[PDB]
């Protein structure tokens, strides 16, 4: 869109400005969803390989949950950074272009004539 905004060090999964954001809390509802997906991956992995579903090599389940949460947690940092970046450069353009975003004038509903169409 992003893409080539001023300062775009390539292949940078976490630019330094991301360190100024509130880090995703470990109890994040998004984060635990990654953990839930990891468990579902473990259940399928035993199901596909004719293994006793739940109680079948819980070590594999631990790896799947750990990988999904860890890979997830770095994803939210980038997810929150870009989302915050979108609003940040946004909030400055409106200042630099005030006439491009004129502010409306106070007109209460007592003066606004919204037509009343009867309903039958």
């Amino acid at each position: 869109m992003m893409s080539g905004r001023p300062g775009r060090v390539p292949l940078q999964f976490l630019p330094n400005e991301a360190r100024s954001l509130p880090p995703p809390k470990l109890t994040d509802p998004r984060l635990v969803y990654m953990g839930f997906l990891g468990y579902c991956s473990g259940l399928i992995d035993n199901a596909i390989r004719r293994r006793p579903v739940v109680s079948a090599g819980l070590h594999r389940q631990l790896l799947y949950v750990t990988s999904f949460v860890f890979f997830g947690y770095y994803l939210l940092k980038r997810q929150d950074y870009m989302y915050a970046l979108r609003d940040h450069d946004m909030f400055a353009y409106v200042k630099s272009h005030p006439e491009d975003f004129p502010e409306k004038d106070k007109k209460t509903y007592g003066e606004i004539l919204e037509e009343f169409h009867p309903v039958r």
Binding site: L37, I44, L75
Partner: protein
Amino acid sequence: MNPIIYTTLIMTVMSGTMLVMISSHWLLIWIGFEMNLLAMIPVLMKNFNPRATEAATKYFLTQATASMMLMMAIIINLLYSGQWTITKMFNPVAMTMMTMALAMKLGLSPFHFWVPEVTQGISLQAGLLLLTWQKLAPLSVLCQISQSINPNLMLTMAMLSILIGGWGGLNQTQLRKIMAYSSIAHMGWMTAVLPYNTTMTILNLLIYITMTLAMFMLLIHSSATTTLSLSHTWNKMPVITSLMMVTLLSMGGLPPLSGFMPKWMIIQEMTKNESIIMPTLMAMTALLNLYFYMRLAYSSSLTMFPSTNNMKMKWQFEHTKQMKLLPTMIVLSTLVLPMTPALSSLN
């Protein structure tokens, strides 16, 4: 093949596309497309059967011709600006030239008759490589030059893929043929959104890639290439058919499965661009895809099909291949809808 010699052919083409996504020079992009073709041909003919010999010939002639058409698109742009860098094109006919040239490398519009025949001839393992990796290379260039794209030029290509992919998919029998037509239909979705915002084009690519591996490697496990052959797998491996059904629903697009990931955002994106008749046709004609997904779903797991006595012998032996990444690929293609705001990472 010799395992070490098939390895380099598998990943010379890995590198061929890798060059395209990193090259800033027009000639180098053609170079990666050349290694893309030069390493694709042997893999298609690993088994050496007349279907593969035909499939390689059809694939080579189509891709080679598109590559040649790409070159003069490069030359004309050079002839009118003298710039070898990849940016917005500086002349109309050059822009029109490569859009068709890049299209034929990918294959969405009438330049799609090769896609079904080539995958039908070649083996299932090479099928996923053709239908998944061989689409990032053309798409990387298109996302790069999306600014200069001609909005009329691309969108009519986009529907003609989904309408053709939607229509002909009903009559197909061979599972590879059905998979190819769905790939054509899926190809239309991100190509349509390509002129507006390439983030959803990449997002559709990633999700579609995830769904296709889940589809292909499950079929590889089923060791089946026909609908009837896939139908039998209900008895020997009932779990696989149940997973066959969930990915079919996912890759159909029904919510809350991950097939609603690309469409919904794509529908939303064009709606912000005032193009509102355009999304409705694609969403509605997407049901044509769902019908032969339903047709496969009915014959695979929802209703069991007659089996054969000899397949009691099949139960006596366990599988051998570990089908790497299959468990994580399935889950990453079914229940990722609640993680939709992750699309901000791509841009």
